[PDB]
Amino acid sequence: HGSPDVNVAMLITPNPTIENNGGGFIEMQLPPGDNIIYVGELSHQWFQK
Amino acid sequence: SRCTHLENRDFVTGTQGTTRVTLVLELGGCVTITAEGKPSMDVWLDAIYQENPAKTREYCLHAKLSDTKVAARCPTMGPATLAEEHQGGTVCKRDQSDRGWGNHCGLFGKGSIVACVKAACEAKKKATGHVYDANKIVYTVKVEPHTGDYVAANETHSGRKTASFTISSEKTILTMGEYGDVSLLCRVASGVDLAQTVILELDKTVEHLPTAWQVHRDWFNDLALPWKHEGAQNWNNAERLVEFGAPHAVKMDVYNLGDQTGVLLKALAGVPVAHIEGTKYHLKSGHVTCEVGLEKLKMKGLTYTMCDKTKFTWKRAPTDSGHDTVVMEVTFSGTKPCRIPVRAVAHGSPDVNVAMLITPNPTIENNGGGFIEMQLPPGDNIIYVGELSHQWFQK
Amino acid sequence: HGSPDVNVAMLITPNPTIENNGGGFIEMQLPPGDNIIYVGELSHQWFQK
């Protein structure tokens, strides 16, 4: 929250993709505090910890 | 936004992770809640009242006296008596008058005399007290989403919702139109203690007076006026408004102390007013703490394209809100719906956006949008709504 | 009031029942303070003391 330029997401799921019959589940780690998760233009507030 | 209508306004802000917010709402106040990724909300305690509270005593402010009767006996004839001396609803005084041949007695001496009057109360001259039951008192809370539409105080915002709370029903879930659901947990037990409160009512139909007062129970119970229970036929201590003159021969005058309303009103100056609306007895001052759940709220218009930067004009130029924020309203002549490209820069630094928006994701809908409230740093700034600009000196 | 999970009613009337031609009167003891009495979904506020 406040620094829209720095990506702070550490992905556990490798190269997330939407296959013809799968994909979509993502697991990631975020730093403590208020963050906003973006999947393209889709967004979600997230307070970590 | 409703909160912009009053001077008493607070701003509550939830940061990253903040999903719940605890507020202390006060009658006459208003709270603007803002939170990252959530549409902003205006919340306020609107009323505190109880319908048909229990009545304690009724007091009489102006006695209506009638049917004065006097009985007198000569010095050797024994006690004077009247049937009224034993009836309720009469005030009597027994005394002795000087008698002799001049007023037809055989002896010159003291003779028994008794005078009585029927005592009632003038129509609409009562002062009645009412007491609250914490279990029946209702607290009304209103919520209004920030929709980018400005509505004046005499107008009704279509998105405003109302929630009522009693001690036995502390939680409500409200559906804020397309913004999602908001949960409200307000605890009436956290409200005003009413043990020593009495709502005093005179004649609520009098035009140049408040309809009620909030007074202390001990003061009310000590009023030196005739009193009775609602429903009772007669008054206790009616003698408090009646005086008897010294007797002379076979007569004794009865005096009425007049209307005590003026006397009471002097005592009531400086006492807080209350209000009665039909059967509802309202407090005009009070507070309650609520917990607001924001997790189910969603913003509107995030996937619209940006509005054409060339089609904005000012309907209401930027103006000081009185809450250290700037309010304004734009008109858009392009195709709707779309996101409004708003920003502001400090004079001399065109690269840094310094605008902190109160209004969430400003958009021009097919039939709304355009009102924006923001905060700017002190000094000279320039507000931009696309290519539309406006100078603004903050402070 | 505030603890909907704990039953605080101490019944004087044993196994209250509605018979074909009787039942319905109940006498109970409650702890001091604000309580809510429930007879199924029927409820009633009760301040004890």
Largest interface chains and counts: A-B, 13 and 11 residues
Q: In terms of structural class, how would the helical and strand content of chain A be classed?
A: mainly beta
Helical residue percent band of chain A: under 10%
Rough outline of chain A: elongated
Please give the radius of gyration of chain A in angstroms.
12 Å
In oligomeric terms, what are we looking at? part of a larger assembly
Distance between the termini of chain A: 15 Å
Largest sheet of chain A: 2 strands, antiparallel
The total of helices of chain A stands at 0
Can you list the strand order of the major beta sheet of chain A? 1-2
H/E element sequence of chain A: EEEE
Measured by DSSP, the beta-strand proportion of chain A falls in 35-45%
How many β strands of chain A by DSSP?
4
Topology at a glance:
The structure is cut from a larger assembly and holds 3 copies of chain A.
Chain A: E1 10-11, E2 28-29, E3 33-39, E4 42-48
Antiparallel strand pairs in A: 1-2, 3-4
PDB class: virus
Keywords: Flavivirus, Flaviviridae, Dengue virus, glycoprotein E from tick-borne encephalitis virus, Icosahedral virus, Virus
Entry title: Structure of Dengue Virus
How would you portray this structure in words?
Chains A, C: It comes from Chimeric Tick-borne encephalitis virus/Dengue virus 4. Chains A, C: This is Polyprotein. The structure is cut from a larger assembly and holds three copies of chain A. Chain A is mainly beta and 49 residues long. The first copy, chain A, is 0% helix and 37% strand. Chain A has strands at residues 10-11, 28-29, 33-39, 42-48. At the A-B interface, strand 3 and strand 4 of A face loops of B.
